[PDB]
């Protein structure tokens, strides 16, 4: 077996979502001094906007291969799965996501891109994996407020949903899946809601203080991560 065939095999395995055999292959290769194959494969999954890349990483993390995820994937993956604190930064506008600090309701805090704040604890978040139907999904937890990001049931005229924090996860509205992408020299992700299949985005309508409210966008984003995707920073 040449690197081409072995690589194609590993990639094929990831794309068809046969994760036990993809992990078998990886564990083999990392032992046989063939890390460049796994690394090329990651790069190709990530260039091709393949979602399976998340499940593949998580399966390595769960099956005694954290080290492969640490060495052969970009640091973001480790940041996700180690449930380290992160900042979700909207690529298009360069704002960090947060929850409002002043709320007249007892229920949920509205989410938005913070105009002044890239630093304070208010932009700290954590992603929490769960496994269902051969797929990986995430709860998104604001660390200061101990509240989960959700989309609501209501919609505006175009059919976007509001995003805000809620105390717990009892539905698919509070779950999310990631689709990796590349722009410039960095890794980005679109973030879709599990219930409604909409991407989390910031409105083009600016608030006086530079703010932009967060919405579940009803529209097409694939192809333009420099407009609709998020960077994950180590905080």
Residue numbers in the entry: 5 to 239
Recite the paper's sentences.
The study reports two crystal structures of Bmlp3, a protein belonging to the 30-kDa lipoprotein family found in silkworm hemolymph. Members of the 30-kDa lipoprotein family are the most abundant protein fraction in the hemolymph of silkworm fifth instar larvae. The Bmlp3 molecule consists of a helical N-terminal domain (NTD, residues 1–87) and a β-trefoil C-terminal domain (CTD, residues 88–239).
The crystal structure of the second crystal form (Bmlp3-c2) was solved using a model (Bmlp3-p21) with the correct amino acid sequence. There are two protein molecules in the asymmetric unit of the Bmlp3-c2 crystal. The Bmlp3-c2 model contains residues 5–239 in each chain. The dimer present in the Bmlp3-c2 structure is formed through interactions between the CTD domains in a tail-to-tail arrangement. The results of PISA analysis of the Bmlp3-c2 structure suggest that the dimer present in the asymmetric unit could be also stable in solution. In molecule A this loop is shifted by about 5 Å compared to the same loop in Bmlp3–p21, whereas in molecule B this shift is about twice as large and the loop is bent. Such an arrangement of loop 106–116 in both protein molecules stabilizes the dimer. The central part of the dimerization interface is occupied by an iodide anion from the crystallization solution. The iodide anion forms hydrogen bonds with three water molecules, with I…O distances ranging from 3.2 to 3.7 Å, and with two nitrogen atoms of the protein backbone (Gly158A/B) with the N…I distances of 3.7 and 3.9 Å.
